[PDB]
Design a protein around this ligand. Structure first.
Ligand code: NI
Length: 437
């Protein structure tokens, strides 16, 4: 790529967007050569991988005394640091983890996870302040997008009715297909239903989502399943080795409604997501791959809570001093409040980070708890909410738990986040924290 030829991309203040179409080799070949160019020249470099899977891939033939790796971490002891998007945010929530680099390279910089938005927002702000060089690598950069970008090989894109979960008759083209398929679903619940029918038809299935990706994605090339039923987690560099993509073009849609994070209905994916889902196939020029979709894209995702959670993380990995931080360029329009609105002190920030790393709290719930609570062992907010926030158990009844002293309470949080009781998270897990374990 022309922009990264020579050394000009290394100067402080330079922002390089490596937006090559999928299959160009940006992750496994262009990035390691960028890292090795930074390493043999003694420049402090930060490399951000989307997930731990890709981190260990990035590791191969790079780690040593030159490149120092991190699995969220908190250890201090190395000019090139390679870590995940969330690990970068989590380390900057610490006083001991606010180190800076003169060159920063972020792979899959399109990820709309709040940690990724805050990570590229902070690095973009540092680059705009002439304090580091920034390289963003993604086939779908933030901005205007094409749902059908170029591929290395031909893709047959055809609109078809796609089952909304299980199906009993019809949709024969699904099971007749000779080859492996990647089926994108809006949620884990929908993916479970799709997987039931597929296994009933005698097909091998591997389900990929936010909780199973780090462990099960490795089994895809090993076992070569007929179908990979995945959420949007596979839009960030996953090589599923399939010849057909089935894409309902929908996604779950966490929104803050009436001070509560709701999980109702689905939204049409953005043009960037559909391009990334379609980008799973056509990766080279041999055969003709298939992209079966349904519906049109919707780029207006401003109402999603991920943008508020991104500013929540960005405000707490930055400091009141100096210039105000922003989201990456075009995404700044979606910052819901003025920056710094969610900044907490060092004491509340440790509680804020503890709820996320040790209690699996969402950034939204972790912030609301940390900013209104004074004692980290106090759990009274979990049962002092309004009657509308009462949580039902697996049997549909009220969730009753005993505090360590003997008192019986009903799960009723002041701040209700529906993501804590479904989509990978179990209501039992919230009870362990509520009951004081
Ligand atoms: Ni890639």
């Amino acid at each position: 790529p022309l922009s990264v030829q020579g050394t000009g991309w290394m100067s402080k203040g330079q922002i390089t967007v490596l937006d090559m179409h999928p299959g160009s080799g940006k992750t496994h070949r262009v990035l390691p050569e960028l890292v090795r160019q930074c390493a043999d020249r003694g420049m402090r470099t930060l490399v951000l991988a989307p997930t731990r899977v890709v981190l260990k891939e990035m590791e191969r033939a790079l780690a040593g005394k030159k490149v120092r790796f991190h699995s969220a971490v908190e250890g201090q002891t190395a000019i090139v640091d390679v870590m995940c998007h969330a690990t970068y945010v989590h380390r900057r929530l610490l006083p001991q983890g606010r180190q800076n680099w003169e060159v920063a390279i972020m792979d899959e910089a399109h990820w709309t996870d709040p940690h990724s938005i805050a990570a590229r927002g902070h690095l973009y702000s540092l680059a705009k302040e002439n304090r580091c060089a920034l390289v963003l690598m993604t086939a779908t950069p933030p901005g205007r997008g094409d749902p059908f970008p170029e591929s290395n090989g031909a893709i047959m894109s055809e609109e078809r009715a796609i089952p909304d979960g299980e199906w009993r008759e019809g949709f024969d083209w699904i099971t007749e297909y000779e080859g492996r398929t990647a089926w994108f679903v809006p949620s884990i619940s929908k993916g479970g239903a799709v997987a039931r029918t597929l296994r009933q038809r005698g097909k091998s299935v591997i389900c990929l989502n936010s909780k199973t990706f780090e462990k099960d994605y490795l089994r895809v090339r090993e076992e070569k399943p007929d179908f990979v039923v995945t959420t949007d987690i596979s839009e960030m560099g996953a090589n599923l080795d399939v010849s057909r993509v089935i894409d309902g073009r929908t996604n779950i849609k966490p929104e803050e409604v009436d001070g509560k994070v709701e999980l109702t209905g689905t939204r049409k994916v953005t043009t960037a997501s559909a391009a990334q889902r379609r980008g799973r196939v056509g990766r080279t020029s041999g055969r003709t791959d298939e992209y079966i979709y349904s519906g049109q894209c919707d780029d207006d995702d401003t109402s999603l809570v991920q943008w508020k959670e991104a500013q929540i993380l960005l405000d707490n990995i930055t400091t009141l001093r100096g210039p105000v931080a922003t989201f990456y360029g075009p995404e700044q329009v979606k910052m819901p409040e003025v920056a710094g609105h969610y900044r907490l002190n060092e004491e509340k920030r440790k509680h804020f980070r503890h709820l996320m790393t040790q209690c699996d709290f969402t950034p939204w719930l972790a912030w609301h708890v940390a900013t209104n609570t004074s004692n980290v062992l106090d759990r009274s907010w979990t049962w002092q909410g309004p009657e509308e926030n009462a949580i039902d158990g697996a049997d549909g009844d009220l969730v009753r738990f005993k505090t360590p002293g003997g008192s019986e309470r009903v799960l009723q949080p002041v701040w209700k986040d529906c993501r804590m009781f479904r989509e990978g998270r179990d209501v039992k897990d919230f009870i362990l924290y509520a009951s004081g374990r």
